[PDB]
Design a binder for this molecule. Structure first.
Ligand SMILES: [Mg+2]
Ligand SMILES: [Mg+2]
Ligand SMILES: [Mg+2]
Ligand SMILES: [Mg+2]
Ligand SMILES: [Mg+2]
Ligand SMILES: [Mg+2]
Ligand SMILES: [Mg+2]
Ligand SMILES: [Mg+2]
Ligand SMILES: [Mg+2]
Ligand SMILES: [Mg+2]
Ligand SMILES: [Mg+2]
Ligand SMILES: [Mg+2]
Ligand SMILES: [Mg+2]
Ligand SMILES: [Mg+2]
Ligand SMILES: [Mg+2]
Ligand SMILES: [Mg+2]
Ligand SMILES: [Mg+2]
Ligand SMILES: [Mg+2]
Ligand SMILES: [Mg+2]
Ligand SMILES: [Mg+2]
Ligand SMILES: [Mg+2]
Ligand SMILES: [Mg+2]
Ligand SMILES: [Mg+2]
Ligand SMILES: [Mg+2]
Ligand SMILES: [Mg+2]
Ligand SMILES: [Mg+2]
Ligand SMILES: [Mg+2]
Ligand SMILES: [Mg+2]
Ligand SMILES: [Mg+2]
Ligand SMILES: [Mg+2]
Ligand SMILES: [Mg+2]
Ligand SMILES: [Mg+2]
Ligand SMILES: [Mg+2]
Ligand SMILES: [Mg+2]
Ligand SMILES: [Mg+2]
Ligand SMILES: [Mg+2]
Ligand SMILES: [Mg+2]
Ligand SMILES: [Mg+2]
Ligand SMILES: [Mg+2]
Ligand SMILES: [Mg+2]
Ligand SMILES: [Mg+2]
Ligand SMILES: [Mg+2]
Ligand SMILES: [Mg+2]
Ligand SMILES: [Mg+2]
Ligand SMILES: [Mg+2]
Ligand SMILES: [Mg+2]
Ligand SMILES: [Mg+2]
Ligand SMILES: [Mg+2]
Ligand SMILES: [Mg+2]
Ligand SMILES: [Mg+2]
Ligand SMILES: [Mg+2]
Ligand SMILES: [Mg+2]
Ligand SMILES: [Mg+2]
Ligand SMILES: [Mg+2]
Ligand SMILES: [Mg+2]
Ligand SMILES: [Mg+2]
Ligand SMILES: [Mg+2]
Ligand SMILES: [Mg+2]
Ligand SMILES: [Mg+2]
Ligand SMILES: [Mg+2]
Ligand SMILES: [Mg+2]
Ligand SMILES: [Mg+2]
Ligand SMILES: [Mg+2]
Ligand SMILES: [Mg+2]
Ligand SMILES: [Mg+2]
Ligand SMILES: [Mg+2]
Ligand SMILES: [Mg+2]
Ligand SMILES: [Mg+2]
Ligand SMILES: [Mg+2]
Ligand SMILES: [Mg+2]
Ligand SMILES: [Mg+2]
Ligand SMILES: [Mg+2]
Ligand SMILES: [Mg+2]
Ligand SMILES: [Mg+2]
Ligand SMILES: [Mg+2]
Ligand SMILES: [Mg+2]
Ligand SMILES: [Mg+2]
Ligand SMILES: [Mg+2]
Ligand SMILES: [Mg+2]
Ligand SMILES: [Mg+2]
Ligand SMILES: [Mg+2]
Ligand SMILES: [Mg+2]
Ligand SMILES: [Mg+2]
Ligand SMILES: [Mg+2]
Ligand SMILES: [Mg+2]
Ligand SMILES: [Mg+2]
Ligand SMILES: [Mg+2]
Ligand SMILES: [Mg+2]
Ligand SMILES: [Mg+2]
Ligand SMILES: [Mg+2]
Ligand SMILES: [Mg+2]
Ligand SMILES: [Mg+2]
Ligand SMILES: [Mg+2]
Ligand SMILES: [Mg+2]
Ligand SMILES: [Mg+2]
Ligand SMILES: [Mg+2]
Ligand SMILES: [Mg+2]
Ligand SMILES: [Mg+2]
Ligand SMILES: [Mg+2]
Ligand SMILES: [Mg+2]
Ligand SMILES: [Mg+2]
Ligand SMILES: [Mg+2]
Ligand SMILES: [Mg+2]
Ligand SMILES: [Mg+2]
Ligand SMILES: [Mg+2]
Ligand SMILES: [Mg+2]
Ligand SMILES: [Mg+2]
Ligand SMILES: [Mg+2]
Ligand SMILES: [Mg+2]
Ligand SMILES: [Mg+2]
Ligand SMILES: [Mg+2]
Ligand SMILES: [Mg+2]
Ligand SMILES: [Mg+2]
Ligand SMILES: [Mg+2]
Ligand SMILES: [Mg+2]
Ligand SMILES: [Mg+2]
Ligand SMILES: [Mg+2]
Ligand SMILES: [Mg+2]
Ligand SMILES: [Mg+2]
Ligand SMILES: [Mg+2]
Ligand SMILES: [Mg+2]
Ligand SMILES: [Mg+2]
Ligand SMILES: [Mg+2]
Ligand SMILES: [Mg+2]
Ligand SMILES: [Mg+2]
Ligand SMILES: [Mg+2]
Ligand SMILES: [Mg+2]
Ligand SMILES: [Mg+2]
Ligand SMILES: [Mg+2]
Ligand SMILES: [Mg+2]
Ligand SMILES: [Mg+2]
Ligand SMILES: [Mg+2]
Ligand SMILES: [Mg+2]
Ligand SMILES: [Mg+2]
Ligand SMILES: [Mg+2]
Ligand SMILES: [Mg+2]
Ligand SMILES: [Mg+2]
Ligand SMILES: [Mg+2]
Ligand SMILES: [Mg+2]
Ligand SMILES: [Mg+2]
Ligand SMILES: [Mg+2]
Ligand SMILES: [Mg+2]
Ligand SMILES: [Mg+2]
Ligand SMILES: [Mg+2]
Ligand SMILES: [Mg+2]
Ligand SMILES: [Mg+2]
Ligand SMILES: [Mg+2]
Ligand SMILES: [Mg+2]
Ligand SMILES: [Mg+2]
Ligand SMILES: [Mg+2]
Ligand SMILES: [Mg+2]
Ligand SMILES: [Mg+2]
Ligand SMILES: [Mg+2]
Ligand SMILES: [Mg+2]
Ligand SMILES: [Mg+2]
Ligand SMILES: [Mg+2]
Ligand SMILES: [Mg+2]
Ligand SMILES: [Mg+2]
Ligand SMILES: [Mg+2]
Ligand SMILES: [Mg+2]
Ligand SMILES: [Mg+2]
Ligand SMILES: [Mg+2]
Ligand SMILES: [Mg+2]
Ligand SMILES: [Mg+2]
Ligand SMILES: [Mg+2]
Ligand SMILES: [Mg+2]
Ligand SMILES: [Mg+2]
Ligand SMILES: [Mg+2]
Ligand SMILES: [Mg+2]
Ligand SMILES: [Mg+2]
Ligand SMILES: [Mg+2]
Ligand SMILES: [Mg+2]
Ligand SMILES: [Mg+2]
Ligand SMILES: [Mg+2]
Ligand SMILES: [Mg+2]
Ligand SMILES: [Mg+2]
Ligand SMILES: [Mg+2]
Ligand SMILES: [Mg+2]
Ligand SMILES: [Mg+2]
Ligand SMILES: [Mg+2]
Ligand SMILES: [Mg+2]
Ligand SMILES: [Mg+2]
Ligand SMILES: [Mg+2]
Ligand SMILES: [Mg+2]
Ligand SMILES: [Mg+2]
Ligand SMILES: [Mg+2]
Ligand SMILES: [Mg+2]
Ligand SMILES: [Mg+2]
Ligand SMILES: [Mg+2]
Ligand SMILES: [Mg+2]
Ligand SMILES: [Mg+2]
Ligand SMILES: [Mg+2]
Ligand SMILES: [Mg+2]
Ligand SMILES: [Mg+2]
Ligand SMILES: [Mg+2]
Ligand SMILES: [Mg+2]
Ligand SMILES: [Mg+2]
Ligand SMILES: [Mg+2]
Ligand SMILES: [Mg+2]
Ligand SMILES: [Mg+2]
Ligand SMILES: [Mg+2]
Ligand SMILES: [Mg+2]
Ligand SMILES: [Mg+2]
Ligand SMILES: [Mg+2]
Ligand SMILES: [Mg+2]
Ligand SMILES: [Mg+2]
Ligand SMILES: [Mg+2]
Ligand SMILES: [Mg+2]
Ligand SMILES: [Mg+2]
Ligand SMILES: [Mg+2]
Ligand SMILES: [Mg+2]
Ligand SMILES: [Mg+2]
Ligand SMILES: [Mg+2]
Ligand SMILES: [Mg+2]
Ligand SMILES: [Mg+2]
Ligand SMILES: [Mg+2]
Ligand SMILES: [Mg+2]
Ligand SMILES: [Mg+2]
Ligand SMILES: [Mg+2]
Ligand SMILES: [Mg+2]
Ligand SMILES: [Mg+2]
Ligand SMILES: [Mg+2]
Ligand SMILES: [Mg+2]
Ligand SMILES: [Mg+2]
Ligand SMILES: [Mg+2]
Ligand SMILES: [Mg+2]
Ligand SMILES: [Mg+2]
Ligand SMILES: [Mg+2]
Ligand SMILES: [Mg+2]
Ligand SMILES: [Mg+2]
Ligand SMILES: [Mg+2]
Ligand SMILES: [Mg+2]
Ligand SMILES: [Mg+2]
Ligand SMILES: [Mg+2]
Ligand SMILES: [Mg+2]
Ligand SMILES: [Mg+2]
Ligand SMILES: [Mg+2]
Ligand SMILES: [Mg+2]
Ligand SMILES: [Mg+2]
Ligand SMILES: [Mg+2]
Ligand SMILES: [Zn+2]
Lengths: 70, 95, 107, 97
RNA sequence: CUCUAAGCACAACCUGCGGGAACCCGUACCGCAAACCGACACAGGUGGGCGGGUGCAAGAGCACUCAGGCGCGCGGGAGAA
RNA sequence: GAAUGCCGGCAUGAGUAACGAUAAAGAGGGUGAGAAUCCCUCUCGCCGUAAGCCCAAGGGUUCCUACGCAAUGGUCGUCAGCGUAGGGUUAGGCGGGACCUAAGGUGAAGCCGAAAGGCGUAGCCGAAGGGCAGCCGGUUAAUAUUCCGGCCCUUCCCGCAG
RNA sequence: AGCCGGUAGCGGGCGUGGAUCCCUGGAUGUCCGAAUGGGGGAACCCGGCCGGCGGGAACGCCGGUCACCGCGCGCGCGGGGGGAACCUGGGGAACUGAAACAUCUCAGUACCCAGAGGAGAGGAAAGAGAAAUCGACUCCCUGAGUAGCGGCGAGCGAAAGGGGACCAGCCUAAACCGUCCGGCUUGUCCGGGCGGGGUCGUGGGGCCCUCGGACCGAAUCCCCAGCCUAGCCGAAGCUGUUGGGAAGCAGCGCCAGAGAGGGUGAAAGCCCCGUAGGCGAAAGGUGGGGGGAUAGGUGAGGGUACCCGAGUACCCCGUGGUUCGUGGAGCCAUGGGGGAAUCUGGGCGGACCACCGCCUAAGGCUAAGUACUCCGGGUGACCGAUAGCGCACCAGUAC
């Protein structure tokens, strides 16, 4: 997404505990599956949202992997 | 992280899959290495239903070419889940 | 590591050579993969279009064709003259494009 | 036969040279070579059975180094050997070289 | 299935009933062939099962037929050697 | 300029031989720019211990449907096992594995060999052999002992009873 | 200052609040593969144990762990496999040449195998060989097609010496002390560890007497420069003209530590990319150079004769290596047999003996100079699409 929103996403993710982080990823993964459904019926005009959520999930798992590895 | 949303990939959009909604059988594209027990738990976490039967089948990719370049579409796997009596998956009854 | 581009969107440049030599115009776009630029009003070619949406009449449109970047020279906004580009390190440490004629900044 | 466990003596390649004629030092015109071909020379490997710490240890040794085996039996009296396996025993005796 | 050893006989096994649980891969199509082996949509080669009826001494033979499947992916004429 | 030279291009033979079983065709209607060759109907002929049907190998989308005809098809082509796209293979009971062993292979123990390696009991692997619980019908354009319907059954876990 | 790879488009986004992109470190990294829980027809299948997930006990999924082999007191550590050529070791042809052919040649080559590493080997004299000499090893030139070897045929082919490259020397075994443990032939015992001692050829060391009481310094460790893995600054030209286009032609200038080269519409020092000359690393790699530590290193006589690497030297048998093919056949190596001594010992100087000299065997390590080119860059009286790599291109592909 926008570069400032990535930065804010990383500040907030880093204030989350591993349990919060897992629960967020589980939520964003659900929304990603919702995006794939929508895109498969031709309903996702804004297809950039699929990639954005995928990288979001990557950042969150990266920070989750950070917090179990200081 | 491995969630139910990693097992279930997309619904199967075909007149054959649609004809199964009436009996409570919903067809999904699922992950190729996912077992029947896994798909059961993944549907029951994803769509708030009870799964009483899961059939599965592998669907080999179609060989295709583009001019000089012969290739192959990825392999896929379909799962058909039967939900408990009187239940329904609203995200599919769409359609 | 990068294609060196002495000219930017959308400073003002002289087309110093070619059929449109002497023209002054704004850099509409810069194409590094092609070492080209597009200059407003310069290199106008007639492209043929099929009947369609966007051109329900068919016919032709006008298009600016690209120019090789070396045919183009920025006009310095201080002294207003065409010039080669020099580099200059600001007080903070950043480098900017300055005018070889006078010394003014070109951004 | 293979390798002397004590000296590492192993088969070597030697030539077998067939000769005719009378040696010059006997008044002949000299020796002529009527055939050269490869053969192997083996160590005189034998089995030596010795009993160390109430176990039987069997060495595959060149006859030349048979006394070197009993030498290792002596040098093993200072080693704490009982309770060990015949394999682990032979290693101790062999490490004493 | 039966016999017993360690063990254990709050266990354990057998019988009966009840609820629950039951995974992975194949499954299309061709398959005596134009889709397999023979460079070919090649008169060749390819293991197992079903293989109806009538008559002929019998039979999986032979002739004609059922079900079923084909007329073999160049044709039209002429009626010399 | 020659090496029956090498690679390629194009000639000649020649509009010639051939067009791959002598089981065989005829007509009407349709479609289409185009029809002996595609679809439909009637007539005719051929196989029928197969030239019909079902398994297994092997092959690997060739299946079904829509749109196509440059090339592939020994002619033609509107057709096709061809091109483009979409769809299609559903199992506790069928087959294989979470079972068994056969030749053989491998191989703790052990034996042998310059090296690489060769052997080798048990054990392990190894099947179209042993073992093990599903029959009939309906349904799709295309799957069905698999989905559905009816009637049956097996194993594992846990509980109760004897 | 643009960007979402080749790659346009549909449809949607990102970037001076610094994106794309380039370098470095990290994170993730399904499955197979040495492949290593077990099996297997590589990329599939099937388990044990601990923890988790679901209604979860059966079923499944997720995370962790579980091969064999070696070495040290069940715990660690290590090994496995790969790498274009190069290297060492273990094995090791033939065509061919000898105008036939067998000794000989091809050749210890091709190849197989084991292993090593950025190199590998070798290496600190039991050397050379004749100089009253030299002084580790490797590598180049020469010596030299010499000396020799050779069915004295075909052919094969040294070393010393000289000129150069590089330069560097070390640890140990034994004597004799100490300690620990073991043994039961009870001790002034034997053995095994570990520590101290000690390392040489004019011999040296041990042990006992007298005397004399800081320089040297790693090949190991630390720091640093330098270098590598992205980059960056970089002089000076305008006009007219012919022309699609100027860089051509013409006029008038200008830079040069830069007039290498490539581009731009044709032929440009001054338009562009560059060039000369300069500048540059938070991170990783290197660091043979500068600095610093550590390990380490070191006397004289005198007496004593304790020690100085064993199935070894040495001799004989059978062979290999060398220029040496049995030759007068030594030397180095060793498969078989026999089998010593510790300096008053032993090996060598081409049978052997004398004399005269050289050197210290049977333990180990050691940079540099040398080789190679998978990789990167620079340069060609190298190729220019039948050429040059087999491949300029979706090639180790189609087939
Ligand atoms: Mg997705
Ligand atoms: Mg998809
Ligand atoms: Mg993601
Ligand atoms: Mg993951
Ligand atoms: Mg459905
Ligand atoms: Mg499945
Ligand atoms: Mg699950
Ligand atoms: Mg299935
Ligand atoms: Mg399956
Ligand atoms: Mg698929
Ligand atoms: Mg696919
Ligand atoms: Mg996809
Ligand atoms: Mg799928
Ligand atoms: Mg620049
Ligand atoms: Mg002008
Ligand atoms: Mg333009
Ligand atoms: Mg400049
Ligand atoms: Mg900056
Ligand atoms: Mg700036
Ligand atoms: Mg400005
Ligand atoms: Mg002989
Ligand atoms: Mg004589
Ligand atoms: Mg002879
Ligand atoms: Mg001779
Ligand atoms: Mg020979
Ligand atoms: Mg022989
Ligand atoms: Mg023996
Ligand atoms: Mg004996
Ligand atoms: Mg005995
Ligand atoms: Mg002897
Ligand atoms: Mg020794
Ligand atoms: Mg008991
Ligand atoms: Mg009890
Ligand atoms: Mg039951
Ligand atoms: Mg399983
Ligand atoms: Mg098959
Ligand atoms: Mg089927
Ligand atoms: Mg079928
Ligand atoms: Mg059929
Ligand atoms: Mg036949
Ligand atoms: Mg048959
Ligand atoms: Mg058939
Ligand atoms: Mg057919
Ligand atoms: Mg075919
Ligand atoms: Mg063939
Ligand atoms: Mg065929
Ligand atoms: Mg045919
Ligand atoms: Mg045929
Ligand atoms: Mg037959
Ligand atoms: Mg029969
Ligand atoms: Mg009948
Ligand atoms: Mg009958
Ligand atoms: Mg009848
Ligand atoms: Mg009659
Ligand atoms: Mg009858
Ligand atoms: Mg009859
Ligand atoms: Mg009959
Ligand atoms: Mg018949
Ligand atoms: Mg019929
Ligand atoms: Mg017919
Ligand atoms: Mg016919
Ligand atoms: Mg036929
Ligand atoms: Mg025909
Ligand atoms: Mg005629
Ligand atoms: Mg000629
Ligand atoms: Mg010819
Ligand atoms: Mg020729
Ligand atoms: Mg020719
Ligand atoms: Mg030719
Ligand atoms: Mg040819
Ligand atoms: Mg050609
Ligand atoms: Mg030709
Ligand atoms: Mg030709
Ligand atoms: Mg031709
Ligand atoms: Mg002609
Ligand atoms: Mg012709
Ligand atoms: Mg012709
Ligand atoms: Mg004619
Ligand atoms: Mg003729
Ligand atoms: Mg004729
Ligand atoms: Mg012919
Ligand atoms: Mg013919
Ligand atoms: Mg004819
Ligand atoms: Mg016939
Ligand atoms: Mg015919
Ligand atoms: Mg006939
Ligand atoms: Mg007939
Ligand atoms: Mg007709
Ligand atoms: Mg007809
Ligand atoms: Mg009519
Ligand atoms: Mg037709
Ligand atoms: Mg037609
Ligand atoms: Mg007709
Ligand atoms: Mg016909
Ligand atoms: Mg028809
Ligand atoms: Mg009729
Ligand atoms: Mg019949
Ligand atoms: Mg095929
Ligand atoms: Mg196809
Ligand atoms: Mg066609
Ligand atoms: Mg056609
Ligand atoms: Mg045509
Ligand atoms: Mg077409
Ligand atoms: Mg054709
Ligand atoms: Mg045709
Ligand atoms: Mg044909
Ligand atoms: Mg048509
Ligand atoms: Mg068909
Ligand atoms: Mg098709
Ligand atoms: Mg189908
Ligand atoms: Mg079932
Ligand atoms: Mg299981
Ligand atoms: Mg099994
Ligand atoms: Mg078994
Ligand atoms: Mg073994
Ligand atoms: Mg051997
Ligand atoms: Mg074996
Ligand atoms: Mg066996
Ligand atoms: Mg088993
Ligand atoms: Mg097997
Ligand atoms: Mg088995
Ligand atoms: Mg079986
Ligand atoms: Mg039997
Ligand atoms: Mg069976
Ligand atoms: Mg069964
Ligand atoms: Mg039944
Ligand atoms: Mg049925
Ligand atoms: Mg349907
Ligand atoms: Mg069918
Ligand atoms: Mg049923
Ligand atoms: Mg009870
Ligand atoms: Mg859009
Ligand atoms: Mg767009
Ligand atoms: Mg700013
Ligand atoms: Mg920055
Ligand atoms: Mg993993
Ligand atoms: Mg494995
Ligand atoms: Mg295995
Ligand atoms: Mg558990
Ligand atoms: Mg549930
Ligand atoms: Mg559980
Ligand atoms: Mg499991
Ligand atoms: Mg596990
Ligand atoms: Mg290997
Ligand atoms: Mg290696
Ligand atoms: Mg070599
Ligand atoms: Mg060698
Ligand atoms: Mg070799
Ligand atoms: Mg041989
Ligand atoms: Mg020969
Ligand atoms: Mg010969
Ligand atoms: Mg020759
Ligand atoms: Mg010859
Ligand atoms: Mg000759
Ligand atoms: Mg001859
Ligand atoms: Mg010969
Ligand atoms: Mg020879
Ligand atoms: Mg040769
Ligand atoms: Mg030789
Ligand atoms: Mg070679
Ligand atoms: Mg070097
Ligand atoms: Mg070295
Ligand atoms: Mg020394
Ligand atoms: Mg020397
Ligand atoms: Mg001297
Ligand atoms: Mg000396
Ligand atoms: Mg020196
Ligand atoms: Mg001379
Ligand atoms: Mg010779
Ligand atoms: Mg020779
Ligand atoms: Mg020789
Ligand atoms: Mg030679
Ligand atoms: Mg030599
Ligand atoms: Mg000499
Ligand atoms: Mg010299
Ligand atoms: Mg001691
Ligand atoms: Mg010591
Ligand atoms: Mg010491
Ligand atoms: Mg010392
Ligand atoms: Mg010392
Ligand atoms: Mg010491
Ligand atoms: Mg010294
Ligand atoms: Mg001396
Ligand atoms: Mg002395
Ligand atoms: Mg040094
Ligand atoms: Mg050192
Ligand atoms: Mg610059
Ligand atoms: Mg410049
Ligand atoms: Mg003009
Ligand atoms: Mg001009
Ligand atoms: Mg001029
Ligand atoms: Mg220059
Ligand atoms: Mg140049
Ligand atoms: Mg140039
Ligand atoms: Mg010029
Ligand atoms: Mg030029
Ligand atoms: Mg020129
Ligand atoms: Mg230029
Ligand atoms: Mg130039
Ligand atoms: Mg420079
Ligand atoms: Mg520079
Ligand atoms: Mg530099
Ligand atoms: Mg230093
Ligand atoms: Mg010194
Ligand atoms: Mg001293
Ligand atoms: Mg001294
Ligand atoms: Mg002595
Ligand atoms: Mg010595
Ligand atoms: Mg020694
Ligand atoms: Mg001996
Ligand atoms: Mg001697
Ligand atoms: Mg003899
Ligand atoms: Mg000898
Ligand atoms: Mg030799
Ligand atoms: Mg000799
Ligand atoms: Mg010799
Ligand atoms: Mg000799
Ligand atoms: Mg000797
Ligand atoms: Mg000897
Ligand atoms: Mg002496
Ligand atoms: Mg002596
Ligand atoms: Mg000697
Ligand atoms: Mg001598
Ligand atoms: Mg000497
Ligand atoms: Mg002499
Ligand atoms: Mg000497
Ligand atoms: Mg020495
Ligand atoms: Mg070395
Ligand atoms: Mg070196
Ligand atoms: Mg290169
Ligand atoms: Mg290059
Ligand atoms: Mg040329
Ligand atoms: Mg070409
Ligand atoms: Mg070529
Ligand atoms: Mg050309
Ligand atoms: Mg050429
Ligand atoms: Mg290449
Ligand atoms: Mg290449
Ligand atoms: Mg080629
Ligand atoms: Mg290709
Ligand atoms: Zn200016």
């Amino acid at each position: 997404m926008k570069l400032s929103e990535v930065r804010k996403q990383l500040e907030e993710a880093r204030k989350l505990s591993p349990v919060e982080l897992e629960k967020l990823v589980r939520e964003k993964k659900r929304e990603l599956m919702e995006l794939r459904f929508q895109a498969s019926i031709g309903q996702l005009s804004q297809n950039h949202k699929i990639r954005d959520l995928k990288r979001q999930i990557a950042r969150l798992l990266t920070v989750l992997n950070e917090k179990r590895r200081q | 992280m491995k969630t139910a949303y990693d097992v279930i990939l997309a619904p199967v959009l075909s007149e054959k899959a649609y004809a199964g909604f009436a009996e409570g059988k919903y067809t999904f594209w699922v992950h190729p290495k996912a077992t029947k027990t896994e798909i059961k738990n993944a549907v029951e976490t994803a769509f708030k239903v009870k799964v009483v039967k899961v059939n599965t089948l592998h669907v080999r990719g179609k060989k295709k070419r583009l001019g000089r370049y012969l290739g192959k579409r990825p392999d896929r796997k379909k799962a058909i889940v039967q939900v408990a009596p009187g239940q329904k998956i609203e995200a599919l009854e769409g359609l | 590591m990068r294609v060196k581009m002495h000219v930017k969107k959308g400073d003002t440049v002289l087309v110093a050579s070619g059929k449109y030599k002497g023209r002054v115009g704004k850099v509409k776009e810069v194409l590094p993969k092609k070492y080209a630029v597009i200059v407003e009003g310069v290199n106008i070619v007639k492209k043929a279009v099929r009947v369609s949406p966007k051109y329900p009449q068919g016919g032709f449109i006008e298009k600016e064709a690209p120019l090789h970047a070396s045919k183009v020279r920025p006009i310095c906004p201080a002294c207003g003259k065409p010039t080669r580009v020099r580099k200059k390190f600001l007080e903070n440490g950043k480098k900017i494009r300055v005018c070889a004629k006078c010394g003014g900044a070109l951004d | 036969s293979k390798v002397c466990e004590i000296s590492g003596k192993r088969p070597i390649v030697a030539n077998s040279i067939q000769r005719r004629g009378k040696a010059k030092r006997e008044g002949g015109v000299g020796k002529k070579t009527t055939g050269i071909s490869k053969r192997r020379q083996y160590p005189n490997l034998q089995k030596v059975r010795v009993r160390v710490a109430g176990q039987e240890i069997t060495f595959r040794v060149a006859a030349s180094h048979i006394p070197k085996v009993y030498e290792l039996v002596e040098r093993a009296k200072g080693l704490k050997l009982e309770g060990l396996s015949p394999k682990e025993i032979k290693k101790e005796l062999l490490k004493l070289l």
